[PDB]
Design an enzyme around this catalytic site. Sequence first.
Site, short mmCIF file in Angstrom:
data_model
loop_
_atom_site.label_atom_id
_atom_site.label_comp_id
_atom_site.label_asym_id
_atom_site.label_seq_id
_atom_site.Cartn_x
_atom_site.Cartn_y
_atom_site.Cartn_z
N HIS A 87 68.16 51.08 59.17
CA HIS A 87 68.08 49.65 58.93
C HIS A 87 68.39 49.32 57.48
CE1 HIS A 87 64.41 49.44 56.55
NE2 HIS A 87 63.99 50.46 57.27
N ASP A 99 65.77 53.91 64.56
CA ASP A 99 66.06 53.32 63.26
C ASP A 99 66.34 54.42 62.25
OD1 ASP A 99 65.53 50.77 64.26
OD2 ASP A 99 63.48 50.85 63.71
N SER A 114 61.24 51.59 52.04
CA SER A 114 61.59 52.29 53.26
C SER A 114 62.37 53.56 52.97
CB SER A 114 62.40 51.41 54.17
OG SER A 114 62.89 52.15 55.26
#
EC number: 3.4.21.90
Lengths: 51, 151, 151
Positions: free
Chosen positions: B29, B51, B103
């Site tokens: 992502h 993801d 992330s």
Amino acid sequence: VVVVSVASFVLLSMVGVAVGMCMCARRRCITPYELTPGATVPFLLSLICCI
Amino acid sequence: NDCIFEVKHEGKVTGYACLVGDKVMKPAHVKGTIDNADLAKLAFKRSSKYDLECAQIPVHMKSDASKFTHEKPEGYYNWHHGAVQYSGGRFTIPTGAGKPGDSGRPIFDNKGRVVAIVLGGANEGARTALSVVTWNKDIVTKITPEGAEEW
Amino acid sequence: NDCIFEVKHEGKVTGYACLVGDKVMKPAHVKGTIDNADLAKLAFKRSSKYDLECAQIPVHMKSDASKFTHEKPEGYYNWHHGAVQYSGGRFTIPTGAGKPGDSGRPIFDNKGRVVAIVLGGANEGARTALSVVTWNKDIVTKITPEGAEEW
């Protein structure tokens, strides 16, 4: 001519689809093993699939 | 420290990539490319289901990578922005401990082994549950708390 | 000292280019581009006979050019990786004194003048002979030992 040409096209299209879905199925089935660190593909899975 | 790389898009870091075991892991992502040209040119396999993007580590020139385990006992684990509590099978941190852009950061156990990669999280009072990538024998799974947002 | 500019490929230095006299001199066998934008945009000419690539130095960079000489008396000359001995028409350094990636580095005389550019060399016992680019009067000549490796 029309029936043979169209029927041939459709049959070839169906084969192309059968092959296309096979590689999609292989990609989906194998990816999770290739996506996983340290993972080893099971012999049976690596035997049936080209990996 | 260890083996973590920045992922940049435009003029900013959008997330991180890391070397775990024999494979390079990056959140799917996250937009942008890996700062290290050696990894940036590396082809990745993408799966939107997890993801997650992965590619084999070029160990011939970068054999240095984090150790990993499938064991995830209840207890505490470490990461770059603090400590994370593992309870009820879920990873939980203080709400101010995480943020968008973090992330791709790995979670380590007390042996220095990687157990999970952080994707995002959800706010539950003063604590936030994390959306993480975890793995068990030969399989990778994604655990996402309800309402969790990508970071 | 400040003659040298880096030549990079995929983020790595693959050799050097430096400003000598009125023109930019770099190894032609080195893959990559010059880090300096003013030099990077220059058109370059190449000669596979000399493994030499060159371009004219921009006027505003004229002051950064090094001094050079065609004179090559027997004796010791200086360079980045220690000293280099010149005798018999051959430049020699201690074995292992230089490395791959050192190509493009100049050799200076005792007055700080550039004498030759190092392209490569070969390890013969305790000493390694260098493959260099030098000038005699009005032309560039190439001196290479029977064995040689590109740096």
